[PDB]
Write a protein that binds this ligand. Structure first.
Ligand code: NI
Ligand code: NI
Ligand code: NI
Lengths: 153, 103, 80
């Protein structure tokens, strides 16, 4: 459990779109003029939840909390029908799942805190193309790097 | 700002300029780097020769069209004695075939 | 003000010195010759430098799959 949670929060730090202690008001101000689908993840200020997705809808920024229970992440079951909810060990996986599923929850482009490294941008690109890392013409160190973050967003 | 690649033969200059700045002013930038005066330069957008007095915006170099991550190409030709050389830009190298797994 | 970065195939990229310092490698080392980085990779590296400096709402940085593997190696080599 702590080992799994550690891996999940490490992935979340690698995204470049985790805003940590951002307040509710700060997120709305940040997403106010963003295109529809633009999203970020931040800490939830609510006792029952770890994280929140702040996302621009056509009607303004809105918030969807992420539950973390039994070592699994899932979207807010108070807002979404509990029975229709997929559970994930990884919260970046949760986000990636929904981003891809609309390529239900309309997520498109993340709001980066700062410019990602070129290395990381290359990783995203390679991830869009294959999961077969073992077959790539790269040194082991760079394969290890790809292995650390397998998501397309 | 408009983000540019000024290209001649096997030289490429990465630079930015205001949409409101002129072709001539861009030649002054080229002169500072490559040491050839404006009247020994011709600038192009594709095959279209660009007039000194036009702003970059009027030539079709807009902030939407010329981004940091995808700069617009300006071609550059120098004087070659009694004339101008033909506009010529050497292509960048070709990428290899994708690995199979990258399908 | 500017530096020259030369690809393996001999293309010369003239970029603002400030922008080039995005690479820890370049920062550590007027011209730099990259014997192992071809122009289809180096050109995109220079665009990365512009993008990173300009964004330090951050837009997407698109990379063609066909250059992604070489670009990764170059980025890792350049520490950027
Ligand atoms: Ni829902
Ligand atoms: Ni999972
Ligand atoms: Ni030529």
């Amino acid at each position: 459990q702590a080992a799994r949670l550690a891996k999940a929060l490490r992935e979340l730090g690698q995204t470049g779109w985790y805003w940590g202690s951002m307040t509710v008001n700060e997120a709305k101000e940040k997403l106010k003029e963003a295109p529809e689908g633009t999203f970020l993840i931040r800490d939830s200020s609510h006792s029952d939840y770890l994280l929140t997705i702040s996302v621009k809808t056509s009607a303004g920024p809105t918030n969807l909390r992420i539950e973390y229970q039994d070592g699994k992440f899932r979207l807010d079951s108070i807002i979404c029908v509990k029975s229709k909810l997929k559970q994930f060990d990884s919260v970046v996986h949760l986000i990636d799942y929904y981003v891809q599923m609309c390529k239900h929850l309309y997520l498109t482009k993340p709001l980066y805190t700062s410019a990602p490294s070129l290395q990381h941008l290359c990783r995203l690109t390679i991830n869009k193309c294959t999961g077969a890392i073992w077959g790539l013409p790269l040194p082991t160190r760079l394969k290890d790097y790809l292995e650390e973050y397998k998501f397309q967003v | 700002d408009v983000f540019l690649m000024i290209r001649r033969h096997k030289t490429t200059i990465f630079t930015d300029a205001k949409e409101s700045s002129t072709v001539f002013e861009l030649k002054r930038i080229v002169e500072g780097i490559l040491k050839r005066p404006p009247d020994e330069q011709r600038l192009y957008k594709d095959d279209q020769l660009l007039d000194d007095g036009k702003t970059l915006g009027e030539c079709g170099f807009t902030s939407q069209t010329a981004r940091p991550q995808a700069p617009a190409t300006v071609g550059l030709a120098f004087r070659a004695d009694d004339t101008f050389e033909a506009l010529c830009i050497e292509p960048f190298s070709s990428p290899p075939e994708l690995p199979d797994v990258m399908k | 003000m500017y530096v020259k970065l030369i690809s393996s195939d001999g293309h010369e990229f003239i970029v603002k010195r400030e922008h080039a310092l995005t690479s820890g490698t370049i920062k550590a080392m007027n011209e730099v010759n990259f014997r192992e980085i071809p122009s289809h990779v180096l050109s995109k590296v220079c665009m990365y430098f512009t993008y990173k400096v300009r964004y330090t709402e951050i837009p997407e940085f698109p990379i063609a799959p066909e250059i992604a593997l070489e670009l990764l190696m170059a980025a890792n080599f350049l520490d950027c």
